Amino acid sequence: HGEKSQQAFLRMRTLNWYDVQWSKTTVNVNEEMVLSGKVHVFSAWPQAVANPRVSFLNAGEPGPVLVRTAQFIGEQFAPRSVSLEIGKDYAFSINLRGRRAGRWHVHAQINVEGGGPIIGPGQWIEIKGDMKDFTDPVTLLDGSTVDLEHYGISRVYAWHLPWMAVGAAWIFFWFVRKGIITSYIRVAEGKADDVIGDDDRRIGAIVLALTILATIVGYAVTNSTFPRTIPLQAGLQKPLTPIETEGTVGVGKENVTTELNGGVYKVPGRELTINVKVKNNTSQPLRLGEYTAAGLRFLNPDVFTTKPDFPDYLLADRGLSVDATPIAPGEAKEIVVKIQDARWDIERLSDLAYDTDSQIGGLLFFFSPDGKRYASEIGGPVIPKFVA
Amino acid sequence: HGEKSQQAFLRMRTLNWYDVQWSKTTVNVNEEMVLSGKVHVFSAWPQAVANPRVSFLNAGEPGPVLVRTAQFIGEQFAPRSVSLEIGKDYAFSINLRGRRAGRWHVHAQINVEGGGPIIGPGQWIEIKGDMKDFTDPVTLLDGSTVDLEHYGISRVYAWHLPWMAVGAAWIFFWFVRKGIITSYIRVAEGKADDVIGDDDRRIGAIVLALTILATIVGYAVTNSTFPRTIPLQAGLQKPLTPIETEGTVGVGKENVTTELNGGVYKVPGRELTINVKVKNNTSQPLRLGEYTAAGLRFLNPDVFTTKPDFPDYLLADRGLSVDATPIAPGEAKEIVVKIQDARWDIERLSDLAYDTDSQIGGLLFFFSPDGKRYASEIGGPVIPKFVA
Amino acid sequence: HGEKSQQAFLRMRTLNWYDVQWSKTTVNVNEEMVLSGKVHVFSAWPQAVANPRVSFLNAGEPGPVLVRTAQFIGEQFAPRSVSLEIGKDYAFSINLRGRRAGRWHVHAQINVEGGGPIIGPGQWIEIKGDMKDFTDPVTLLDGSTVDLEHYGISRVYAWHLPWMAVGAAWIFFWFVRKGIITSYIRVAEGKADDVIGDDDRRIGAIVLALTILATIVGYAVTNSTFPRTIPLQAGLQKPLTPIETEGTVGVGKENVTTELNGGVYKVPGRELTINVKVKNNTSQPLRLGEYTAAGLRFLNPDVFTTKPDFPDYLLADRGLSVDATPIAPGEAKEIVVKIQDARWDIERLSDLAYDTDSQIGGLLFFFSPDGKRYASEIGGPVIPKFVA
Amino acid sequence: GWGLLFYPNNWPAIAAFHQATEQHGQLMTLADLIGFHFVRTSMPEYIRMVERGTLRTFGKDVVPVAAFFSGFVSMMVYFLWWFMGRWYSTTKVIDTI
Ligand SMILES: [Cu+2]
Ligand SMILES: [Cu+2]
Ligand SMILES: [Cu+2]
């Protein structure tokens, strides 16, 4: 939740999410599920958003309703910030363990630095069980196992609460011994020396000595209990490994190149008609089957005869309409692509007319007779058609 | 005008301008002409100047004497800032419509960000006619045509002038009703309550209510008149497309590579003798025909038998002298190039001895027997020879 | 001296120094020696250290005990800052002339900008002679020769000392003429006009006129003595040329690729056991002969039968132990590399457990039957084994 | 005057090291060569905030512009520090610390 309120042109021109899966839509407490996906970095990265040089993969849940045991992006385990390069594809996976019972919308997201957060597709997950049954077992370097949910909290209380009690006792002792109105009147008449005497200073000195002794004893006992500790581990990770499989954007001799010659979107309609110059550098005829948005999917019903397993609020199984003529290998063709769905309006992609850059962006997928998929990046300026 | 005052080494080592044309040197009012050219980004970009990552193509005229209907750089229409990469060539074009009669020096320039402006070659253009005959027709999205010279000014006056009159009336009313000396004396004697009474507060309240009503009415009427408006469009454009034609710097197997082994320039003379190691990776013998400067051209009279159509203040048709031996294909040769022209002194390229980096830079063009041109980038430190 | 105190993971993951030589270990006064070497930039450059875009090659000596006549990095004479690119190799050389007698530890270092200094291997140099016999001859553009050790100091004294004497005379004159207590008492009783009169103002005016005349005369005489001067030369140099010889990291078809599958280092032991996946893209079987550290060398005694000429405090001629099986061409093999030397502890590379990033980095060298060397970059996280 | 007179009275001790020399391929001043020859371990060349050129620098106005800017700022700094010195000359005796 929250993406609809973000500007359409920034959502479309930053990260193009594609195949995203949720291994389980219903999990028990202490049950693991994997949210995987792929992301493409738009070549024309907006000037408003900072470079993806510093970014962090994250799970968009309403809290620790699922515990992230691990996450991997760019063929690397990624507990800290990573680097995404412009115009490259990266695969990601997140392991999540059920904690809190209920129905929750869990998304894939990437928080880029001072540009900010980019939210991907989400799905409703049902967690059944009791949160009291949740365990988070963690093994240490010495082989000891702890429960990360409950570990170390008793020590925190046993150190923090007694000192608060001591401070309250100090304040209460001085307040009862001297008072506020009486002390004020004594100080106001020049008798400020009557408030504090030698015995009070001696009591303060004894209290300070005891406090220092307690601090030293606590430090020594803590060091004895935990003789070997390490500092917090932080820093940017090594450069990631992009996807280099056949069919993705930026791969070898066989590919598709699409250029946006022009587009019109209705205001406040639900339509978007674009003109695409397509160059087919593969060996087989291709049909356009999908247009990809900020997380939305507009599918060609002639290519996608049966709708796939995707969240309902982002899946337009009939949203894309084109001609029924395949693009022959080595043929450059200009085609007219129509995107028409109520999801274009619900997800506030029709609010493009409110932005300071009236541009679209995303991925186009082309399919062979045998089902091989080729991805191309489309983007560019569009014109609003104002209708009443 | 203004380039001569800029440091020579920054002019030479930032942007190398080449073939630059002015379609018309004399235009009428409402008559269009095209200023085209090409630019090379010097590989050893100075540390003083910021990166050309943010830059804007511009026409260096003394004002809107010509109206820029369009401009294109890097195969893209460029009304906003673009990105230039180091060591690449970009072609640019600017369309200009005559507005003000007179003779004006119109230049090609590129304003890079916090480095600043870089000025290219300029030419004198004669605009004949009356500025009152100038029109700037612009079509809107609804098909309506407006005159950009005159559109919207009447609304600006009709909103701004009456409010200024109202403010003047307010000041005059209070000044005449109360005065300055009388009000000062009344306030000074403790009679400040005599200046302002209930009727004055009532008048102020009525005036404020009327002002608020007028503001609301104006806003509503303005929204009714223009129901559909868009915000200002701003932002960096997508990456540009460099020149990839044969013969430019950074192209395929056939090329020229020139390295500056050493150079001497006289102070305050007009000469510059340099030593160039030339590697010829083409299939035909080449003769050096031109050295390119901050916008100056030093031509070999043996190669350029007839001087081309270039502005007189930048064209040294006899400024370059070398040996008359062609460089055979695949041959590495050390040659001595002499640059000698008064334009080297007039354009203050001889002020290199005042800079904090005594370096030269530019482009060398080599020509085949059939006239094919190959460009190479030359640059490096030079030594001043002090003479009296 | 000073590197031991720097964090191990920053030393290992910034610059990998290899073959480093000192042409002479004993020089006389006015005798030249050359310190040469090569450096590799670690691909996973730490986020803590700034980019090597701005860096300066330097000699780590305890002062001008040797005079740097020249230094070259990246095939360029480098008196100013240069640029080092991530994942590339650069060769450097420094010429040093003996100045001060004694034994000094002279290192290769590179000062990167706001990351800071990186120190390479050092060696003890014995300089024999008298510093009074040292000369620093420098030729000017007019052919005149000066001694850089002694040139221009007499002018500095002759301009600076007389003005200090004049200021002292001014203070002393006013102090003796008026005094402090007497002047204070005169001013305190309202007789401040008695302290300063017309004659005092006239004396001050005459002194100011003489001072201005002296300044103008000095400026004119100085300009007459040195009619031709140039400003200080500063700025980043042109991009460097990396090493492209066979066997270095990032070269053609024949190479070695090493990936760190995992490593363990004892705390506070002297050992480091790592697991290396090695892909051999050469035509001959290879044996691992050396691991390179922040400047340390851990050699395989089966490959390095005789220890080379290296400083004793960085040379572990028996520090590397592996299996005695050569890696066949085109074979991917997982090997276990043991590093064991007291130099790992002395150089405080065992303090990895104190850092916020428990990672290692460096270079692995593989050798053929005929002695050809292939370099690969290794790095990644390691695990501390706490022992008592 | 204090801002304007700084450079003319420093020139006599400065010009001797501003003579030009030619090294391996480059042009140097004697001051740059003095700094280069006598090695400072912690003074790389990039640290010095010296002028490096600008596209808005004009026809030999660097030193006068610097001098006039220094004088103008020195006016305000003098005005502030005169009163700073007046405050430091206080004879006020306080009763409680
Ligand atoms: Cu959601
Ligand atoms: Cu002009
Ligand atoms: Cu040392």
mmCIF file of C-alpha atoms in Angstrom, chain B residues 1-132:
data_model
loop_
_atom_site.group_PDB
_atom_site.id
_atom_site.type_symbol
_atom_site.label_atom_id
_atom_site.label_comp_id
_atom_site.label_asym_id
_atom_site.label_seq_id
_atom_site.Cartn_x
_atom_site.Cartn_y
_atom_site.Cartn_z
ATOM 1 C CA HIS B 1 31.164 38.415 -28.306
ATOM 2 C CA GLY B 2 32.893 37.629 -24.923
ATOM 3 C CA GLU B 3 34.995 34.463 -25.730
ATOM 4 C CA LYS B 4 38.338 36.376 -26.209
ATOM 5 C CA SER B 5 38.280 37.228 -22.442
ATOM 6 C CA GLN B 6 37.996 33.516 -21.493
ATOM 7 C CA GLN B 7 41.179 31.571 -20.738
ATOM 8 C CA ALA B 8 42.783 30.005 -23.799
ATOM 9 C CA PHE B 9 43.462 26.607 -22.231
ATOM 10 C CA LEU B 10 39.862 26.226 -21.054
ATOM 11 C CA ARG B 11 38.524 27.230 -24.476
ATOM 12 C CA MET B 12 40.828 24.763 -26.249
ATOM 13 C CA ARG B 13 40.305 21.803 -23.900
ATOM 14 C CA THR B 14 36.508 21.781 -23.436
ATOM 15 C CA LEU B 15 34.639 21.800 -26.767
ATOM 16 C CA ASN B 16 36.081 21.555 -30.278
ATOM 17 C CA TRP B 17 33.592 23.027 -32.743
ATOM 18 C CA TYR B 18 33.618 21.828 -36.340
ATOM 19 C CA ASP B 19 31.655 22.146 -39.427
ATOM 20 C CA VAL B 20 29.344 25.035 -38.537
ATOM 21 C CA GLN B 21 26.954 26.587 -41.040
ATOM 22 C CA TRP B 22 24.496 29.468 -41.248
ATOM 23 C CA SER B 23 21.840 28.749 -43.863
ATOM 24 C CA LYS B 24 21.158 32.456 -44.426
ATOM 25 C CA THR B 25 23.335 35.460 -43.633
ATOM 26 C CA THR B 26 20.488 37.865 -44.492
ATOM 27 C CA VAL B 27 16.916 37.152 -43.387
ATOM 28 C CA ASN B 28 13.673 39.095 -43.307
ATOM 29 C CA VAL B 29 11.366 39.459 -40.334
ATOM 30 C CA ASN B 30 9.440 36.187 -39.856
ATOM 31 C CA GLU B 31 12.058 34.415 -42.009
ATOM 32 C CA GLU B 32 13.706 31.225 -40.754
ATOM 33 C CA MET B 33 17.361 30.212 -40.918
ATOM 34 C CA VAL B 34 19.220 27.191 -39.553
ATOM 35 C CA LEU B 35 22.525 27.294 -37.660
ATOM 36 C CA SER B 36 24.027 23.795 -37.642
ATOM 37 C CA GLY B 37 27.321 22.378 -36.449
ATOM 38 C CA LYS B 38 29.190 19.567 -34.744
ATOM 39 C CA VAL B 39 31.040 19.514 -31.428
ATOM 40 C CA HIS B 40 33.688 17.226 -29.937
ATOM 41 C CA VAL B 41 34.189 16.788 -26.192
ATOM 42 C CA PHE B 42 37.866 16.881 -25.247
ATOM 43 C CA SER B 43 38.959 13.660 -23.548
ATOM 44 C CA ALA B 44 41.177 15.482 -21.025
ATOM 45 C CA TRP B 45 38.325 17.558 -19.650
ATOM 46 C CA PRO B 46 39.678 20.215 -17.253
ATOM 47 C CA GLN B 47 39.209 19.720 -13.528
ATOM 48 C CA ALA B 48 38.205 23.381 -13.198
ATOM 49 C CA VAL B 49 35.132 22.902 -15.408
ATOM 50 C CA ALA B 50 32.378 20.636 -14.132
ATOM 51 C CA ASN B 51 31.365 17.501 -15.998
ATOM 52 C CA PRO B 52 29.241 18.026 -19.138
ATOM 53 C CA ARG B 53 26.665 15.690 -17.580
ATOM 54 C CA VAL B 54 24.298 18.690 -17.393
ATOM 55 C CA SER B 55 24.466 21.057 -20.367
ATOM 56 C CA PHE B 56 22.173 23.191 -22.513
ATOM 57 C CA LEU B 57 22.521 24.121 -26.183
ATOM 58 C CA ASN B 58 21.991 27.819 -26.841
ATOM 59 C CA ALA B 59 22.240 30.568 -29.452
ATOM 60 C CA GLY B 60 24.619 33.396 -28.564
ATOM 61 C CA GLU B 61 22.768 36.474 -29.816
ATOM 62 C CA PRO B 62 22.539 39.941 -28.202
ATOM 63 C CA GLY B 63 18.916 39.201 -27.300
ATOM 64 C CA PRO B 64 15.765 37.842 -28.932
ATOM 65 C CA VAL B 65 16.747 39.385 -32.263
ATOM 66 C CA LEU B 66 16.031 35.890 -33.603
ATOM 67 C CA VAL B 67 13.338 33.656 -32.105
ATOM 68 C CA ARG B 68 14.380 30.039 -31.534
ATOM 69 C CA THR B 69 11.548 27.925 -32.914
ATOM 70 C CA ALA B 70 13.421 24.653 -32.311
ATOM 71 C CA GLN B 71 16.815 23.193 -31.492
ATOM 72 C CA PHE B 72 18.160 19.643 -31.709
ATOM 73 C CA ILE B 73 21.313 18.101 -30.237
ATOM 74 C CA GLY B 74 22.301 14.440 -30.252
ATOM 75 C CA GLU B 75 19.443 13.370 -32.560
ATOM 76 C CA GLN B 76 16.908 14.721 -30.040
ATOM 77 C CA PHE B 77 14.719 17.798 -29.783
ATOM 78 C CA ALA B 78 16.304 19.634 -26.857
ATOM 79 C CA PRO B 79 14.252 22.306 -25.076
ATOM 80 C CA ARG B 80 15.861 21.295 -21.760
ATOM 81 C CA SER B 81 19.244 20.198 -20.428
ATOM 82 C CA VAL B 82 21.060 17.283 -22.071
ATOM 83 C CA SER B 83 24.108 15.147 -21.234
ATOM 84 C CA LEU B 84 27.383 15.215 -23.172
ATOM 85 C CA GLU B 85 29.889 12.399 -22.684
ATOM 86 C CA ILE B 86 33.648 12.909 -22.664
ATOM 87 C CA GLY B 87 35.377 12.066 -25.928
ATOM 88 C CA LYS B 88 32.267 11.936 -28.119
ATOM 89 C CA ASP B 89 30.916 13.937 -31.054
ATOM 90 C CA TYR B 90 27.443 15.470 -31.216
ATOM 91 C CA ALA B 91 25.669 17.239 -34.075
ATOM 92 C CA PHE B 92 23.441 20.229 -33.320
ATOM 93 C CA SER B 93 20.975 22.404 -35.220
ATOM 94 C CA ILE B 94 19.035 25.540 -34.243
ATOM 95 C CA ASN B 95 16.128 27.156 -36.105
ATOM 96 C CA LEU B 96 15.869 30.936 -35.738
ATOM 97 C CA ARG B 97 13.171 33.335 -36.943
ATOM 98 C CA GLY B 98 14.010 36.982 -37.611
ATOM 99 C CA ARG B 99 12.576 39.461 -35.100
ATOM 100 C CA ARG B 100 14.625 42.679 -34.853
ATOM 101 C CA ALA B 101 16.164 44.497 -37.807
ATOM 102 C CA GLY B 102 19.911 45.073 -37.721
ATOM 103 C CA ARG B 103 23.276 43.305 -37.944
ATOM 104 C CA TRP B 104 23.934 40.790 -35.169
ATOM 105 C CA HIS B 105 26.732 38.266 -34.358
ATOM 106 C CA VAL B 106 24.995 34.934 -33.657
ATOM 107 C CA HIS B 107 27.053 32.102 -32.178
ATOM 108 C CA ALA B 108 26.671 28.436 -31.330
ATOM 109 C CA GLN B 109 27.166 27.904 -27.640
ATOM 110 C CA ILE B 110 26.746 25.254 -24.964
ATOM 111 C CA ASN B 111 26.200 26.211 -21.327
ATOM 112 C CA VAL B 112 27.581 23.435 -19.162
ATOM 113 C CA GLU B 113 26.611 23.504 -15.483
ATOM 114 C CA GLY B 114 28.805 24.913 -12.804
ATOM 115 C CA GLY B 115 31.710 25.039 -15.199
ATOM 116 C CA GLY B 116 29.785 27.561 -17.294
ATOM 117 C CA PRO B 117 29.395 28.724 -20.898
ATOM 118 C CA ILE B 118 31.418 27.650 -23.927
ATOM 119 C CA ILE B 119 31.062 29.819 -27.039
ATOM 120 C CA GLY B 120 31.503 28.572 -30.589
ATOM 121 C CA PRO B 121 31.849 30.264 -33.974
ATOM 122 C CA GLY B 122 29.641 33.227 -34.775
ATOM 123 C CA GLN B 123 28.478 34.991 -37.915
ATOM 124 C CA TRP B 124 26.954 38.363 -38.775
ATOM 125 C CA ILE B 125 23.269 38.110 -39.720
ATOM 126 C CA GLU B 126 21.352 41.006 -41.284
ATOM 127 C CA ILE B 127 17.650 41.122 -40.387
ATOM 128 C CA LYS B 128 15.574 43.420 -42.606
ATOM 129 C CA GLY B 129 12.026 44.498 -41.843
ATOM 130 C CA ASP B 130 9.903 45.858 -39.014
ATOM 131 C CA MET B 131 9.664 44.259 -35.579
ATOM 132 C CA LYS B 132 5.978 45.229 -35.582
#
